[PDB]
Design a protein around this nucleic acid. Structure first.
Lengths: 50, 192, 257, 50
RNA sequence: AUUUUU
């Protein structure tokens, strides 16, 4: 339903490098539930998996 | 006190073994577990203890209905696709929509299509016309575990209706499971 | 003396300037998950040295007993291990009538005969080792109807004997582990032979450690009607086996000088 | 008399490097006896030292 | 297999 919120990752300090190091790197964002996570009512489906 | 590891600073390459219930905190925050209902709806026994539609068959003759039972990629039962192996009781809910007659129902994990030609000891429960029954088929599988994905992950279901006159109809089938044993969770499924 | 104090020089300061609402800041310092360590792992005759190890992983609440509690395979757990010591048919020749005494019926290359063909239980392992030290348990079987008679000499001949065989007097071979077995009386002979050599270990795939032979003590006296095709079979079992020296697949290696 | 065996050092993973590091390095192989080492009979000489 | 419920 309603979004979890706005997720923003801004640059604080330019990624520094040297002659033998990359001028840009790759990033990965993962997500999971907390130790207090809970789910409650089972409802119909909004999509079909494979 | 709290270590920097529990404050967000960690390393993805140091997560093994699988299953680390590490606590995450910061000032003005702590894992708060608040319950709304007297029990869990996440427990495998509870969630799956609730049926879900499977398929429907429209009969005209007294022929037999053989169908490879499998886990759903459609209802709340899809949560099973997160696992690889299953084993345990299987609840089959059958609705016999007919004016006058009887419906023979049976279930087996045996792949042979000839051990079913007769229905001798494959559980021929009888649902009178216009009735519905819920039979719990035991794990009479020849394989210790049932890959959860297989087009026949669950054993085959048989339906040989015993009609009386020109009467015809349709047999809607939905199902759930009693106490399910799932193992070795695999990666989440994709969408169509 | 410094460079780590970041935790109690920030955790305390606040704890010193805190009001009823408690501290407005907490700081904790410690070592990174990726520390400067070295890991070493050793398997059979192997050693893996890693100076940049990572936390080992494994499935959820795993069971490494690896033993099938249902025994879908009803056999001893150590079946595969002992398999190579299993009893096998080493030879089967036919006792050709009219063979004078002393005549050699059949021989058997010891110990390389247990790896005689790729269909020998011990053939598998025998290929990954150049050295061998083992004991034997032979069972020479010879069947003959009651009407017929005769006798054969089943004797073990170490390399020393095999080497100088012609220099030895037959009829004295009874000094070696043997079994004068009188046909029409015994159908099988049993011989338990321990590791015998002038070297601690014998080269795998070698005729060293001697060889078992079967001679004609007294020729076969086969009556007119009686059958005339007597077969002599040699079976072998390894009382104890030991493969030590590692080597490429079935490559001739010299353990000797 | 008989050789001690075949000694082989094969490459498992190509030696990696960067702009300011060597693309190839030097190696040295040393040999000694174990703590269980023993020698037995003294014999004649096969060579003359200096 | 308090792998019906306490």
């Amino acid at each position: 339903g309603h979004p979890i919120g706005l997720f923003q990752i801004e640059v604080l300090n330019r990624l520094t490098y040297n002659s033998s190091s990359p001028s840009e790197v790759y990033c990965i964002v993962q997500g999971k539930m907390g130790q207090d996570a809970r789910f409650f009512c089972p409802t119909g489906s909004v999509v079909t998996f494979q | 006190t709290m270590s920097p590891n529990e404050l967000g600073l960690t390393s993805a390459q140091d997560d093994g073994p699988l299953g680390q219930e590490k606590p995450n905190y910061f000032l003005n925050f702590r894992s708060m577990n608040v319950d709304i209902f007297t029990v869990s709806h996440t427990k495998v026994d509870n969630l799956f203890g609730r049926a879900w539609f499977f398929m429907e068959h429209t009969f005209t003759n007294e022929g037999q209905w053989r169908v490879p039972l499998e886990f759903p990629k459609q209802g709340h039962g899809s949560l099973s696709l997160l696992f690889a192996y299953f084993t345990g009781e299987l609840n089959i809910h059958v609705l016999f929509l007919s004016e006058r007659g009887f419906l023979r129902v049976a279930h087996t994990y045996d792949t042979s299509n000839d051990r079913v030609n007769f229905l001798s000891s494959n559980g021929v429960i009888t649902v009178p016309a216009g009735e519905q029954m819920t039979l719990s088929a035991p794990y009479y599988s020849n394989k210790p575990l049932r890959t959860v994905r297989d087009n026949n992950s669950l054993g085959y279901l048989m339906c040989k209706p015993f009609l009386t006159g020109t009467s015809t109809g349709k047999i809607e089938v939905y199902l759930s499971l009693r106490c399910p044993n799932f193992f070795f969770p695999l990666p989440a499924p994709k969408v169509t | 003396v410094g460079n780590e104090i970041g935790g109690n020089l920030l955790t305390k300061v606040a704890d010193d300037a805190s009001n009823i609402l408690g501290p407005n800041c907490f700081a904790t310092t410690a070592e990174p998950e990726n520390k400067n360590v070295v890991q070493a792992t050793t398997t059979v005759n192997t050693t893996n040295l890693t100076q940049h190890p990572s936390a080992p992983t494994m499935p959820f609440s795993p069971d490494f007993s690896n033993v099938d509690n249902f025994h879908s395979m009803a056999y001893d757990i150590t079946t595969g291990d002992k398999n190579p010591s299993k009893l096998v048919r080493l030879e089967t020749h036919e006792w050709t009538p009219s063979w004078a005494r002393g005549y050699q019926i059949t021989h058997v290359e010891l110990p390389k005969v247990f790896w005689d063909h790729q269909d020998k239980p011990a053939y598998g392992q025998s290929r990954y080792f150049a050295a061998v030290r083992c004991g034997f348990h032979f069972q020479v079987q010879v069947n003959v109807n009651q009407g017929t008679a005769g006798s054969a000499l089943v004797v073990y001949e170490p390399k020393p004997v095999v080497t100088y065989d012609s220099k030895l007097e037959f009829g004295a071979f009874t000094n070696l582990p043997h079994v004068l077995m009188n046909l029409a009386e015994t159908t099988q002979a049993d011989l338990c032979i321990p590791y015998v050599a002038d070297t601690n270990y014998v080269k795998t795939d070698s005729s060293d450690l001697g060889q078992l032979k079967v001679y004609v003590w007294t020729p076969l006296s086969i009556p007119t009607g009686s059958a005339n095709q007597v077969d002599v079979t040699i079976l072998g079992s390894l009382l104890q086996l030991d493969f030590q020296n590692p080597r490429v697949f079935a490559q001739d290696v010299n353990i000797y000088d």
